[PDB]
Amino acid sequence: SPSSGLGSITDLLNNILSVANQIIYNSAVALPLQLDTLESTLLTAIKSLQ
Amino acid sequence: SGLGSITDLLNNILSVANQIIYNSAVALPLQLDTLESTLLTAIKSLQT
Amino acid sequence: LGSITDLLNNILSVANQIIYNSAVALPLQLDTLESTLLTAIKSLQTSDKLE
Amino acid sequence: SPSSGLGSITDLLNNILSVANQIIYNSAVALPLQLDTLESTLLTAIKSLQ
């Protein structure tokens, strides 16, 4: 209903898209980076044994 | 169910999306830290 | 109802599944990874006391 | 594009759907694959002292 209905719906959809964009950053960049760092830390501690 | 209920759906989706931010940016990273620490101690108990 | 209502219902549905994956399935895999590794390390100690 | 197509709204819903899907793949498949690859690497590093 002019023009706010389009505007209010458009604004929520815009919020949701920015959050999902952040979630895809967390899952495809941040966490994979955290797991790589964790692997090598532990991998180093284990090789530190022999 | 006019514009209002669609606005409820949107709020429900936004709220759930927020929970997913918590899980992925807070809970999982913290779980990984706790795990890293537990294994680090155990490996270290082999050393000394 | 309806096209937008249908799309939104789908999105929500995928979202609830993402909540399960990230709050239940992944933490379970992390716990099991921890358990499995601790067990490898530990059974190794138990293998020290002999030979 | 004709107004009947809804314009702003329709593209947003498609993007959010596309992203949600990629998030599903990352949490259900990619991260699990990386976790398994991690566990093997560490186990193999342990297997190599034994």
Swiss-Prot record, chain C:
Using the record for this protein, list the coiled-coil segments as residue ranges, or answer none.
Answer: none
Where would you find this protein in the cell? Virion membrane; Host cell membrane
Q: Tell me which domain of life the UniProt entry assigns to the organism this sequence originates from.
A: Viruses
The family note in this entry says: Belongs to the paramyxoviruses hemagglutinin-neuraminidase family.
State the domain notes: The C-terminus (head domain) is involved in binding the cellular receptor.
The record's note on quaternary structure and interaction partners says: Homotetramer; composed of disulfide-linked homodimers. Interacts with F protein trimer.
What's this chain's function? Answer: Attaches the virus to sialic acid-containing cell receptors and thereby initiating infection. Binding of HN protein to the receptor induces a conformational change that allows the F protein to trigger virion/cell membranes fusion.
Name under which the protein is recorded: Hemagglutinin-neuraminidase
Q: In which organism is this protein found?
A: Parainfluenza virus 5 (strain W3)
